[PDB]
Design a protein around this ligand. Structure first.
Ligand SMILES: [Zn+2]
Ligand SMILES: [Zn+2]
Length: 80
């Protein structure tokens, strides 16, 4: 029994605040274009394109369901 690690527990608490912030089952936040196509399980690259005449041409971040940013939603990541 060598294994044995831990992760951020009780992540959900009063201190933390979140209003209308989630991923999966999101649609094109653009006006008129109601692309409700289920985005891949990786926000790495999600195009509202889909297929119909809705494709905007600019991928978004399914994580924050907002404009694709070259940074992070909440905070950056690390190997550690
Ligand atoms: Zn769109
Ligand atoms: Zn994001």
């Amino acid at each position: 029994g060598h294994m044995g690690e831990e992760q951020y527990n009780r992540y959900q608490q009063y201190g933390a605040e979140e209003c209308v912030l989630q991923m999966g089952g999101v649609l094109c936040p653009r006006p008129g274009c109601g692309a409700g196509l289920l985005p891949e399980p990786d926000q790495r690259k999600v195009t509202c394109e889909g297929g119909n005449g809705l494709g905007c041409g600019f991928a978004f971040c399914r994580e924050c369901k907002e404009a694709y940013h070259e940074g992070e939603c909440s905070a950056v990541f690390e190997a550690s």
